[PDB]
Design a protein around this ligand. Structure first.
Ligand SMILES: CC(=O)N[C@H]1[C@H](O[C@@H]2[C@@H](O)[C@H](O)O[C@H](CO)[C@@H]2O)O[C@H](CO[C@]2(C(=O)O)C[C@H](O)[C@@H](NC(C)=O)[C@H]([C@H](O)[C@H](O)CO)O2)[C@@H](O)[C@@H]1O[C@@H]1O[C@H](CO)[C@H](O)[C@H](O)[C@H]1O
Ligand SMILES: *[C@@H]1O[C@H](CO[C@@H]2O[C@@H](C)[C@@H](O)[C@@H](O)[C@@H]2O)[C@@H](O[C@@H]2O[C@H](CO)[C@@H](O[C@@H]3O[C@H](CO)[C@@H](O)[C@H](O)[C@@H]3O)[C@H](O)[C@H]2NC(C)=O)[C@H](O)[C@H]1NC(C)=O
Ligand SMILES: *[C@@H]1O[C@H](CO[C@@H]2O[C@@H](C)[C@@H](O)[C@@H](O)[C@@H]2O)[C@@H](O[C@@H]2O[C@H](CO)[C@@H](O[C@@H]3O[C@H](CO)[C@@H](O)[C@H](O)[C@@H]3O)[C@H](O)[C@H]2NC(C)=O)[C@H](O)[C@H]1NC(C)=O
Ligand SMILES: *[C@@H]1O[C@H](CO[C@@H]2O[C@@H](C)[C@@H](O)[C@@H](O)[C@@H]2O)[C@@H](O[C@@H]2O[C@H](CO)[C@@H](O[C@@H]3O[C@H](CO)[C@@H](O)[C@H](O)[C@@H]3O)[C@H](O)[C@H]2NC(C)=O)[C@H](O)[C@H]1NC(C)=O
Ligand SMILES: *[C@@H]1O[C@H](CO)[C@@H](O[C@@H]2O[C@H](CO)[C@@H](O[C@@H]3O[C@H](CO)[C@@H](O)[C@H](O)[C@@H]3O)[C@H](O)[C@H]2NC(C)=O)[C@H](O)[C@H]1NC(C)=O
Ligand SMILES: *[C@@H]1O[C@H](CO)[C@@H](O[C@@H]2O[C@H](CO)[C@@H](O[C@@H]3O[C@H](CO)[C@@H](O)[C@H](O)[C@@H]3O)[C@H](O)[C@H]2NC(C)=O)[C@H](O)[C@H]1NC(C)=O
Ligand SMILES: *[C@@H]1O[C@H](CO)[C@@H](O[C@@H]2O[C@H](CO)[C@@H](O[C@@H]3O[C@H](CO)[C@@H](O)[C@H](O)[C@@H]3O)[C@H](O)[C@H]2NC(C)=O)[C@H](O)[C@H]1NC(C)=O
Ligand SMILES: *[C@@H]1O[C@H](CO)[C@@H](O)[C@H](O)[C@H]1NC(C)=O
Ligand SMILES: *[C@@H]1O[C@H](CO)[C@@H](O)[C@H](O)[C@H]1NC(C)=O
Ligand SMILES: *[C@@H]1O[C@H](CO)[C@@H](O)[C@H](O)[C@H]1NC(C)=O
Ligand SMILES: [Ca+2]
Ligand SMILES: [Ca+2]
Ligand SMILES: [Ca+2]
Lengths: 316, 167, 167, 316, 167, 316
């Protein structure tokens, strides 16, 4: 008469690794590295802005593509490959720093800067910024001499930040195709743009010069920016080639921004995104994308690491 | 033809991780031990609760997929990211390797604890056969078998008879 | 009413980590075993010596609390710092979890070693009661108890008498 | 008759975590994450310099606040929120790189550069740099035309580094409020400052322009620097708007620098500091401050992680 | 004068990690057990295979030994590199410490498994002497010794005689 | 009669560390941190280029030292302390970014840019770039006025990238010793160089000014570069002080570059290098050099960490 002690086993054992052995079979195991991707941006519970053809920096200058977003609010901001910050050719200087500020901004609130003008045209426009015909950046003013060739009066305009938050200020310098074009617009003589705050003075010179047509134009407007602090003033002195801001921007609160090439989906909830979708997982690791952002499992190199959830499998 | 854990596991045991298999005049029977099963499961469940954790730390883009950042800073960023990836990749291989070694040894250790507990219930009335079984040196009916299982077997009742049979 | 480590620990044992509790005609008595206590303590002390280490590596500010650095580099620095913090935070949770598992098993393992050592001193003169005690099958006065404790018990002296009593 | 084996237990057990269980009780446990802060800068055994109202970069240019520190020596250097590098308004370009060099410098030793001048004023001063009335940076010279409006002779001055260590060289460009002011000081015509070494040539133009009054002045002097190598020469060519160095600086040896808002304490010894004090601990981790510097426990997110120093506690 | 593993190791055992040493009328003899040796070696070999790994990740210079990079970025690079070095230095100290503790316990654990296996072959014919040996209570010639070693000893053959001798 | 179980031991035990003890002896142990260095660059199986006196950036501009490498191919590229990118004094702007691009380039393939010229000298040369007497950078052209003092015609030259890869474009600005020298070469008047692509416009002014003689010359030519994208055009407008590219460069494929002061050795194979040689090891860690590159064991601080490969050693 006899009694034995034993333990269970199965025919479907799974291999795992241990400190001592590769592929020891165990009764049960679970994956620890996430491979499963949802090819959508799971946006449920978040105020989402899909910027589409609008590039994020354009929300500040306002080319036509960005008209809907000049004062956007968002918890989650999605940039797209097709988005351009620009209508008239050019770019932002320090673009990426600025992009990063706007991605976590919560959105932006615009405020008028109060500049007005005498002795000059203010209606500079281009066929590259198309609204109801030729137009320009919604938040800027292309200042020009009162007539072709005529002298551009030396000017000063200042703006003080009344609010309790730093104001994003932006301006542009116009780089003409030829000193001859730069004279038609702003008159002959050397052109200079001085931009002074308390914690910032800098000069900018238009560098006219031939260059490839982009959109059929060889001009460039390049944008510069600075943070003006509460109670600080920014002063602008110039005799031409200046693209003046109409409005300043204040950051709303908190957001996260991503870049992506897949559809939004307001039904699924997610907190970890990457260009190709959303990683929904409690697993501690993932092998989908090293640049995933949000609250994420840690990216690892391996596709799989099985964690034993049962004992060694010793079948007969 | 009945054997214990030293030889191998039991495919037929589906109600539990550990069990008892007996042979008497009334035949063969298998039954799961609930306590040692649960002990094991709860320790595994405790591993899972600890390893299925979410970081509460949020990370943001420092990099741009559409418009590549300046090359020097990009190379520093990539180096940093790749270094971190090496660290986590090593941590994750180690975590799983180590936890698996521990899980395996833990389960074996519960088996041993049950075996040792029965050995001590049986006192001088049984002998280890070497395969994870005890040869019991008295008649042990289904009720005496059940009493070994539920920890109520009183070795005094059978001692006289068993010690006599061991010679 | 006297029981061993299988049941629970002893609040009354204050001179040591491990001990002996006996019951004879002269009554009850408890005494610490010095060697197994010290063994355990020294292993723990060895953990501490290793974990109470100081880094000899000096780090300097790359950042400014009063006058914030340029935003791009600041964001790279913060990302790097946060990644490192995740690594260390995981390392530290793991270190403690793992060391604690080991410390607990280690201490249990010293208990087992002492029990096994006594079992082997007693040879065929005693039986395991199942709670961490031995029923000794001869008269064992305070002096015989002390001889078990200090490892001088000679099982031959009592064998004849004990084996006779086990039947 | 019987003997039992047992182990101790207590009523005051402490909970800890293990690979398998949260809150298993053990007989004794010790903290592993340091939370205890000393709200002082424990400076014992170190030559400490509390810079006070003197900003670290001012030790190189010497505005009045920094007069005591023009040649300071230190093992430990403390910066304070109230410190300004500046008397006349402006800032250092590449400030943070330079700050980092000075924090580990050990201090500085000044050496005369040997420049002398003819046909110009050398006594440029401002009410913003107050000593016994109007004054200027101790280590620089504000060069001006010999009289109002008059022409500023084109000049060259060179200085060779004789020592075996790199010399910190500093100079400044004056940005006037208006081209009219820049003429009063340095005469009409365009102004240019060329700064040549063997491994460095660069140009600097004053950009005069209106800007907010700081201390009632709209001028700015912005400081630039370079490391001149052993045996190298730096040459300065200019016709105005140049703030010339009088002395060059050599780094003494080794120091560590911190930023802080608490008192120095030369009685306690410490090696790990942060703005709010000193972390004295052998614990391997801390949860006080992620930016702690010196020789420090590693910062972790968790407030507490108890390490068992005794066995499982199994009371009856 | 012959003793087992509880006392110490055997310098004279060169054909293996574990072994048998016997004493009978024909004298003293030592022999390696192949299976338990190999088991141990293979587990160690498995550690090595896992720890002697090469990273497949390539890293490039972000830094310049001949012409020093700009100071701000250099300081960020050095901080990052030093942080990573701390992480790896801690990982490597931990890896070795932990693997060594495990290797040692593993080898001890194979010794115990062999001892336990022999104890169970011998059944009621031998007693533990306390030093890692069994006093065998019948005549055991070189052939009976070899049968213990190769796992063919049939305890029934000698039981009658051995149990009689234990009294 | 009796049988004992035992295990082996030895007299030559080695100490190792465990979670609980320092210096527990074990039967055998193996090192885990690599200390053994091979003081050669083990190059077997790789197309190696030892650049010698040629600095890596010179392969693009082609000073005499780099004549052999103007179109080099390599899997492994070795830079040396003695290498100079330069014959005429100066330097590359953004040098390190560019160096990093060329280290992983695989080498370079040059293509003519097709510029030709009228009304100007093209033969600018210097004794600092010595071939068969005075010469210049092989891949550039020092443009000068047709005769001393004479006016330099305002010019434009453009080049389009026909290939499917980005083209490395390089040019240079000449900084003369004095406005008097800059007039001899390019005539009086202000000089300006405008460099336009689609994604890049920038101006450059020569800043003439006295500075130390390097090689007996106080002139400097500083090199600038940009990546021109497939199908893009770069346009150059200038009236002097321009050092024009003759050829553009395309990166061949993949390489790794190192810096080193030891001999090449095409007999041993290696994948992990540092300035002092090659680390050949399967050990997971090394204590030779923290800046090692290639596929490497991870650098650690400790010289030794022994991993037990046998049991505890318990001798009698
Ligand atoms: C006093 C004198 O004659 N100085 C000349 C100077 O003197 C040395 C040589 O005579 C001696 O034999 O060799 C060493 C070389 O280590 C001395 O330089 O030489 C300079 C350097 O000139 C060249 C050169 O690079 O070799 C001649 C080239 O043809 C020329 N390249 C051009 C025109 O594109 C080149 C350039 O002018 C500079 O590199 C641009 O910065 O110079 C020679 O210029 C000296 O002549 C004096 O020049 C100065 C202007 O600094 C002034 O006009 C004086 O009147 C003139 O004597
Ligand atoms: C080893 O084996 C068991 C049993 O597996 C199974 O039995 C047969 C019918 C097979 O032909 C298999 O198809 C089947 O998996 C595993 O446990 C079982 O897991 C399955 C799959 O996850 C469970 O399936 C359920 O199916 C429905 C879908 O119709 C879901 O909605 C349920 O929630 C659930 O997923 C099944 O419940 C479960 N069966 C039992 C009796 O427990 C076991 O997991 C496996 N080992 C490993 C490592 O996977
Ligand atoms: C579990 O409990 C013990 C005993 O606790 C003590 O007993 C009672 C009076 C209680 O009411 C408690 O208040 C009291 O602590 C702990 O060991 C004891 O720790 C204390 C506190 O650290 C020690 O006190 C000393 O205090 C003076 C300051 O006046 C110091 O200078 C001494 O160096 C020392 O810190 C005391 O030595 C110690 N007592 C004994 C008998 O060992 C035990 O640590 C605790 N467990 C845990 C995890 O804390
Ligand atoms: C502990 O001890 C053994 C044996 O040690 C040795 O015996 C004596 C002759 C001594 O004077 C020692 O010099 C000698 O090591 C070690 O194993 C032995 O290691 C050696 C050296 O690594 C092995 O040498 C190999 O054999 C060829 C033949 O010449 C060499 O050229 C090769 O380079 C190769 O390494 C040798 O095979 C081996 N001997 C035996 C009997 O196993 C053992 O490594 C050592 N352990 C530790 C941890 O120190
Ligand atoms: C084999 O192991 C797997 C994985 O460890 C087991 O699946 C897991 O089972 C647990 C326990 O049921 C699941 O917990 C579930 O999660 C939530 C929270 O409690 C709840 O909604 C569910 O009711 C349940 O409690 C766990 O999620 C699940 N994990 C995975 C990845 O599927 C499985 O039980 C094991 N198989 C056998 C046959 O034992
Ligand atoms: C509960 O556990 C802790 C272990 O963390 C015990 O406190 C520690 O006791 C050890 C041994 O006494 C202390 O070591 C000491 O080091 C100092 C400085 O190096 C030295 O001057 C002392 O003489 C001593 O050797 C250790 O510092 C101390 N740790 C802490 C954090 O206080 C404690 O004793 C344990 N309690 C009981 C009741 O056992
Ligand atoms: C003491 O431990 C050392 C190190 O663990 C042992 O040396 C190692 O022995 C193994 C084989 O037993 C070697 O594997 C070998 O790989 C090489 C090349 O990859 C191959 O050519 C061999 O035929 C073999 O498979 C391993 O390389 C070697 N390691 C070192 C660092 O030398 C040794 O066995 C132990 N000593 C004793 C006496 O047991
Ligand atoms: C940085 O990494 C990305 C991939 O994540 C790669 O496309 C990019 O080229 C890298 N930069 C360099 C300079 O190698
Ligand atoms: C970097 O981290 C600090 C806190 O350590 C925070 O105050 C600062 O704003 C961060 N920078 C950015 C740009 O988000
Ligand atoms: C960075 O580290 C290198 C050595 O790895 C050292 O020589 C250099 O001084 C460091 N850089 C700075 C800016 O202190
Ligand atoms: Ca508004
Ligand atoms: Ca001095
Ligand atoms: Ca070609």
């Amino acid at each position: 008469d006899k009694i034995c002690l034993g333990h269970h086993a199965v025919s479907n054992g799974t291999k795992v690794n241990t400190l001592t052995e590769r592929g020891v079979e165990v009764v049960n195991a679970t994956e620890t590295v996430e491979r499963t991707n949802i090819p959508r941006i799971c946006s449920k519970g978040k105020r989402t802005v899909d910027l589409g053809q609008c590039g994020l920096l354009g929300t500040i200058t306002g080319p036509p593509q960005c008209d809907q977003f000049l004062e956007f609010s968002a918890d989650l901001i999605i940039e797209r490959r097709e988005g351009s910050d620009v209508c008239y050719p050019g770019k932002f200087v320090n673009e990426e720093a600025l992009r990063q500020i706007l991605r976590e901004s919560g959105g932006i609130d615009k405020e008028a800067m109060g500049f007005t003008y005498s002795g000059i045209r203010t209606n500079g426009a281009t066929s590259a910024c198309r609204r109801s015909g030729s137009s320009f950046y919604a938040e800027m003013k292309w200042l020009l001499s009162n007539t072709d060739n005529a002298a551009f009066p030396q000017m000063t305009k200042s703006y003080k930040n009344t609010r309790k938050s730093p104001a994003l200020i932006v301006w542009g310098i116009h780089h003409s195709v030829s000193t001859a074009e730069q004279t038609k617009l702003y008159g002959s003589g050397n052109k200079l743009v001085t931009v002074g705050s308390s914690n910032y003075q800098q000069s900018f010179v238009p560098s006219p010069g031939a260059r490839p047509q982009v959109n059929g134009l060889s001009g460039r407007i390049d944008f510069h920016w600075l943070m003006l602090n509460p109670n600080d003033t920014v002063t602008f002195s110039f005799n031409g080639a200046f693209i003046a801001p109409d409005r300043a921007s204040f950051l709303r609160g908190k957001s996260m921004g991503i870049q992506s090439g897949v559809q939004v989906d307001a039904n699924c909830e997610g907190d970890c995104y990457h260009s190709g979708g959303t990683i929904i997982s409690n697993l501690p690791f993932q092998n989908i994308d090293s640049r995933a952002v949000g609250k994420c499992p840690r990216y690892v190199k391996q596709r799989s690491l099985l964690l034993a959830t049962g004992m060694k499998n010793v079948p007969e | 033809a009945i054997a214990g854990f030293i030889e191998n596991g039991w495919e037929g045991l589906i109600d539990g991780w550990y069990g008892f298999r007996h042979q008497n005049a009334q035949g063969e029977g298998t039954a799961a031990d609930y306590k040692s099963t649960q002990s094991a499961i709860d320790q595994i469940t405790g591993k899972l609760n600890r390893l299925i954790e979410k970081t509460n730390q949020q990370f943001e883009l420092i990099d741009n997929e559409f418009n590549e950042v300046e090359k020097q800073i990009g190379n520093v960023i990539n180096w940093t990211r790749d270094s971190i990836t090496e660290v986590w990749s090593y941590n994750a291989e180690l975590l799983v390797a180590m936890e698996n070694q521990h899980t395996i040894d833990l389960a074996d250790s519960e088996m041993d604890k049950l075996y040792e507990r029965v050995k001590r219930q049986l006192r001088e009335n049984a002998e280890e056969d070497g395969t994870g079984c005890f040869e019991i040196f008295h008649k042990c009916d289904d009720d005496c078998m059940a009493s070994i299982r539920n920890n109520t077997y009183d070795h005094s009742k059978y001692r006289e008879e068993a010690m006599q049979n061991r010679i």
